[PDB]
Symmetry: C3
Subunit: 176 residues, 3 copies
């Protein structure tokens, strides 16, 4: 128990890239194969200083159409202290990658990567609320239920030293 | 009592945005007791740069007492002062942010700017020998930055909160 | 509560465009101690060269070691186990420029820093991917650097020492151009 400190959370900013390391993949996976929809949370991060506050979540064992077979990957908007200064709904392109942990000087790494434009009609990409059906419900998270198969996750070095890296790159436009 | 700061407080890039919440309360406290002045966190203009601190009068100060918002910025003793030019001489631009969605319409912020005064004491190099008058120093600012009334219009206040933007024109970088 | 968490701060220790500036305060006293304990080494905070890059640390012997012992300030840098090592190219190959900063106002003066730069030699183990603890363990992380960075005599000149502190800058050259 300790106050404001853990305003480190406000110190978490990107590039606008977050790389999120999930350690204990062995224990976590089984723990999630044990209990359905056990969900891993990334630290919250700001797309950019005074920007949108997002967070990534992973289902190591899958969720929905990917339960028990796939890694499921989503992102979500969180209420951030500068929302009123930002355009809404959130509309930046988002790229997820599961990282191939290989030395880029032995063999070029093959990351597992998908990108999307958010859809304006997803309630979670409009301003932190504003009640808009918080009891819809469905995933408070937009993303891929079949991001990578438990089969494919074991190839190459997507898992290494018992950890995966999740990258989420938010396209940071500037050209008016 | 282990605060252990931090110091990792750095403008981006040159920009500090300062959020005052609990705005209603804080004001009703102002007219209840001048001269009171709330402070922004200390912040380095840039990594290894100048330490500054913004302060406000909710309030109003001197010229602005009772009637306006007054805002000032102060130079503070900084760990990298010996490596920097004195007196502090980077353009500083104040803004009170118009919290309207900047996508469907352009916000209109109120902006005052200045090049710091070489005569102005506070901008002199800190830690000369001070005692004991001094602390004195002593923000340069605007007593009538924006009044009551002409605030309240537009979204200069929203959700019981206002944003103070202090932008410092940073030392540029040399040569390709 | 403990409950550090100081380690959450270390992780936010990141070079500014590849640069660490390390301030060594209490230089008189520290120098004094190094004269009485030759193996006494000062250590910068660890720092990432770039956000998800390499974790390094600069270190210094104020009264010298090896060939500079007693006569010079000696200056080194080492590679530390880093959260992101598996994503990196090994061995560390980035160019490093050490400077001892001349603490003069750059407005009139134009400071004259003392500077040395080196390219990590791949034939040393020092810059190989660190062991996951272990491989090896000892203290591990043996640094590369300069036993004779700057003479005691030269450090007394200009403002290399000022207000009982010295500044060490380590600039790591990032490939950047992609």
């Amino acid at each position: 128990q300790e106050l404001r400190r853990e305003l480190e959370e406000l110190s978490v900013g990107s590039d606008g890239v977050l790389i999120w390391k999930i350690g204990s993949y062995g224990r976590r996976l089984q723990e999630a194969k044990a209990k359905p929809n056990l969900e891993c949370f990334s630290p919250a991060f700001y797309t950019h200083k005074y920007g949108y506050k997002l967070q990534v979540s992973a289902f190591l064992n899958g969720n929905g159409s990917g339960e028990g077979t796939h890694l499921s990957l989503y992102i979500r908007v969180l209420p951030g202290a500068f929302d009123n200064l930002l355009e809404w709904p959130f509309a930046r392109r988002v790229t997820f990658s599961l990282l191939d942990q290989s030395d880029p000087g032995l063999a070029k790494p093959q990351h597992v990567t998908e990108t999307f434009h958010p859809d304006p009609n997803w309630k979670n990409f409009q301003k932190p609320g504003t009640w808009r059906g918080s009891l819809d419900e469905s995933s408070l998270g937009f993303g891929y239920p079949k991001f990578i198969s438990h089969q494919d996750i074991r190839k190459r070095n997507y898992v290494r030293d018992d950890a995966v890296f999740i990258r989420a790159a938010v396209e940071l436009p500037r050209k008016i």
